[PDB]
Design a protein around this ligand. Structure first.
Ligand code: FE2
Length: 195
């Protein structure tokens, strides 16, 4: 029943865009509606990749491009869960699938301590936001709800789980981390005979 074809189509179309070698601004502008389309209807995500954990948010790898030009990840917030302030170091598109999340961008002062740098955004199902080192890479995100699971679909300009990046305390202390992945197996989204 899952519309896995819609995920195959997104992956193919995004790779097709990347093949034309756009600069990052053009990439983000034209990938924005590709991802909006995908998360416009919540009828394709495997149950395995929608499952919340009680102690921490989960990150299910859905697909990695052969040349690692992007990864697609299902980010699953259990009720009331929140990330620390952190960066990405690559381009980043976030598409809200179900529930909702708050996104607060941060910038640093000369002393290295992080402060909000824009309004807190509420991301609704179907909506897409973009981040990158060029336009602002740092933010804190949280489940908008205290009592339901929220899920956003993330597309990043690398194998994000293998990227060395950092979280930041309010005091400005920088701590390296590698996010890794919650699933040791990926969904097989390619066996068309099963549809
Ligand atoms: Fe993030």
């Amino acid at each position: 029943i899952l519309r896995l074809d819609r995920l195959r189509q997104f992956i193919g179309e995004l790779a097709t865009l990347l093949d034309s070698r756009p600069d990052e601004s053009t990439l983000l502008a034209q990938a924005h509606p590709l991802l909006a389309e995908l998360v416009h209807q919540d009828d394709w995500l495997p149950e395995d990749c929608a499952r919340p954990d009680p102690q921490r948010y989960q990150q299910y790898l859905l697909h990695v491009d052969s040349r690692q030009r992007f990864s697609v990840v299902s980010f699953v917030w259990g009720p009331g869960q929140i990330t620390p302030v952190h960066d990405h170091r690559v381009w980043c598109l976030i598409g809200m699938l179900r529930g909702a999340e708050y996104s607060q961008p941060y910038a640093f002062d000369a002393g290295g301590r992080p402060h909000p740098s824009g309004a807190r955004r509420r991301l609704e199902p179907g909506e897409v936001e973009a981040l990158s080192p060029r336009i602002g890479d740092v933010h804190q995100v949280s489940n908008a709800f205290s009592d339901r699971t929220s899920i956003s679909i993330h597309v990043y300009g690398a194998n994000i789980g293998a990227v060395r990046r950092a979280v930041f305390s309010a005091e400005g202390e920088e701590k390296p981390f590698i996010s890794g992945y919650s699933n040791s197996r990926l969904p097989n989204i390619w066996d068309l005979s099963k549809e």
